[PDB]
Design a binder for this molecule. Sequence first.
Ligand SMILES: Cc1cc2nc3c(=O)[nH]c(=O)nc-3n(C[C@H](O)[C@H](O)[C@H](O)COP(=O)(O)O)c2cc1C
Length: 138
Amino acid sequence: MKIVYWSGTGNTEKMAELIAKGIIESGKDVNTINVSDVNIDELLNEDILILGCSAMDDEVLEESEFEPFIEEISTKISGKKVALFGSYGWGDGKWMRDFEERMNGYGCVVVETPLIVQNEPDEAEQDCIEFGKKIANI
Ligand SMILES: Cc1cc2nc3c(=O)[nH]c(=O)nc-3n(C[C@H](O)[C@H](O)[C@H](O)COP(=O)(O)O)c2cc1C
């Protein structure tokens, strides 16, 4: 499996590692890829796309790297399964409600409720692991 993410301070990166740990604990392999090192072509062969990005600017996806990546794969992911996640700071998940609506609009099937954690995981470490286990059980 593949986990693609953008992280500015490392909070979403930490979530990605924990989600990966959950998938691995389930007996499966998975690679975590920072959005800047991703190969769209190889990524599109996956049955499930696991994508993460923290809330940026004013409740939107990060603009210089993550957003363009989503726009690029948008026309080629209809019917694909996707799981979404990310860290946030002061809002209540508006950027993620929009992200989920968007992916749905492109024809994707969002397999589980998006996992959003405030600031660094810490207390939510198990929740991240469990999210990965749910994905591996699909
Ligand atoms: C410029 C900037 C804008 C942000 N905008 C939002 C926002 O609109 N809503 C929110 O809840 N958090 C927002 N945050 C806070 C980050 O989402 C939060 O610190 C998160 O933990 C960052 O995770 P990361 O290290 O994975 O980037 C913003 C942070 C920065 C630096």
